[PDB]
Design a protein around this ligand. Structure first.
Ligand code: A1AS2
Ligand code: A1AS2
Lengths: 306, 306
């Protein structure tokens, strides 16, 4: 038992991280087969950041303008191209550590592990959710651009995120690995800002089920609710609507605990309307929304990865 | 910016995990050079758990009674011995993935990363602290015994923990890698229980410094306090005493923020006496005590590992 914000083992991703330098800008790249992926703003100067024409900037570069270090060993760049907001640096060596992988784009509300990286050297690993407003509450300093987010299914790494930029509120924005931004953000200096967020209702319910599995029951009650009555309360507290598909996804957890989904919704309604009265749930005095139903089943059942 | 409970990259440890089977008991082992380390209770039956004489049980075993799987490849056991509460299984192959390592024992209050494992297959990674009562608030199911805890310094893995057992409150007990238990726990079935815990005061102060670095300042005040006056308040709230060495360790953080350590103590005193009044700090409505001053400097400065 127990419940922790748990990331996937990072080893398969560690073997892909490299350091990309262009001019006086160094950041991280992702080395899969013979291609290094990195944010295209690596080619920009400080004044270029202001209003860049990336096609213009790139045509003026050469393969030799890109320095790629894989550990203490240089990789020769033999081609370059731009795909949306990522650069693809063609290298003369396939990464022997390339795991089985996919490039997938995730939904707001879904979670992933981040391998934070500096100078192509991995620094730490942690678990994130894609917020409904398409930002992530990460932990990133200067030089972390090009660190990636991922999930692991059996032996296959599904890459979903590449870090590009920090927004003024201290949250983070980036792209999928095809170079398409999550949310309405661009890789140039504007006054761009996150915009309003909401709480991920289905994830809160999953976490309440995790708590029951782990022995916190004080928030349970005999009452129930209809889906609509619940969603009227959720809207008032800036929670997103709960769908019948969310209810179905919560079925297995509902069955293992014997608490009907709609009964849990009654409990959540009471918690939103009354707070916690100085009590905690799974060591938190806040309702946690960064665990999906899948994450709860994984950790309260014991699925590994090979 | 940002602040996350961040674990070390796990890749170096993933390459050491193996599956150990004895009779009908399977658990995890740690494979370094040509030795596999695992909890000695692997040799126990259900009735053996009751009051085992481990020397007696071990002399009745043979090398061939131990099945070791490294991936889909069996390792031949060529010797066995007991060192305190761990078994040392001598295998005929040195692990080519053996990183540079040390066996270190940590202090209560210190943190480490856990690579949770099942059937020798890593499942997730997360960050833990050694509680003052020598338990850890982990996340472990059946089959996780022999999962290890570690830290990384540059390129060297310092192993500090091996998982043995879950206590009735759902917390976890184990040994260092020499087989010596953390705290007053034994590897046999007794009614053993955790015993009273306290909050790690120096870690809370470090986390308050992390919050200031990240822009939460609402809990700051003009007041200050003496160390003794502070410790009188800390004792009342079940916090451990703050020493002059703790104050010195907090110096760098104090200097970067310009908040004297004793001024931060005044802020903590006020938070303990008044609560948070519905506000949060680094996304928490509780005072967090599982980040050390070292962890805060690492993440608010950007140190990596090679
Ligand atoms: C990557 N290593 C770094 N990000 C950038 O350099 C990125 C890049 C410019 C400006 N970038 C930013 O992230 C923002 N700038 C912004 O204009 C905006 F809108 F707020 F996002 C700054 C934080 C530098 C002001 C372009 C968008 C092309 C990076 C990555 N992660 C975290 C960082 C920090 F916390 C601090 C500084 C750089 C960071
Ligand atoms: C390891 N895979 C497993 N632990 C044991 O099997 C371990 C071993 C017996 C009993 N063990 C326990 O962890 C406790 N038993 C206790 O007597 C006590 F005191 F509470 F710790 C049980 C949870 C099984 C009752 C001996 C001590 C020799 C293990 C590891 N981690 C988590 C587990 C669970 F959450 C549930 C079951 C086994 C767990």
């Amino acid at each position: 038992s127990g419940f922790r914000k748990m990331a996937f083992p990072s080893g398969k991703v560690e073997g892909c991280m490299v350091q990309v330098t262009c001019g006086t800008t160094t950041l991280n790249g992702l080395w899969l087969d013979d291609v290094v992926y990195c944010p295209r703003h690596v080619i920009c100067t400080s004044e270029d950041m202001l209003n860049p024409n990336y096609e213009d900037l790139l045509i003026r570069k050469s393969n030799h303008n890109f320095l790629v270090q894989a550990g203490n060993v240089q990789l020769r760049v033999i081609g370059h191209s731009m795909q949306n907001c990522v650069l693809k640096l063609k290298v003369d060596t396939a990464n022997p550590k390339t795991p089985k992988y996919k490039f997938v784009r995730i939904q707001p509300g879904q979670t992933f592990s981040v391998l934070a990286c500096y100078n192509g050297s991995p620094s730490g690993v942690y678990q994130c959710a894609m917020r409904p407003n398409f930002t992530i509450k990460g932990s990133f300093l200067n030089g972390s651009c090009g660190s990636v987010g991922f999930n692991i299914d059996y032996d296959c790494v599904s890459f979903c995120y590449m870090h590009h930029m920090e927004l003024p509120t201290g949250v983070h924005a980036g792209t999928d690995l095809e170079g398409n931004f999550y949310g309405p953000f661009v890789d140039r200096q504007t006054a761009q800002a996150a915009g309003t967020d909401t709480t991920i209702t289905v994830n809160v319910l999953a976490w309440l089920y995790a708590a029951v599995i782990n022995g916190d029951r004080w928030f349970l009650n005999r009452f129930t609710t209809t889906l609509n009555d619940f969603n009227l309360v959720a809207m008032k507290y800036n929670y997103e609507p709960l769908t019948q598909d969310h209810v179905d996804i919560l079925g297995p957890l509902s069955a293992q605990t014997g608490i009907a989904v709609l009964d849990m919704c009654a409990s959540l309604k009471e918690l939103l309307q009354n707070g916690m009265n100085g009590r905690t749930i799974l060591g938190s005095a806040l309702l946690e929304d960064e665990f999906t139903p899948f994450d709860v089943v994984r950790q309260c059942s014991g699925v590994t990865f090979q």
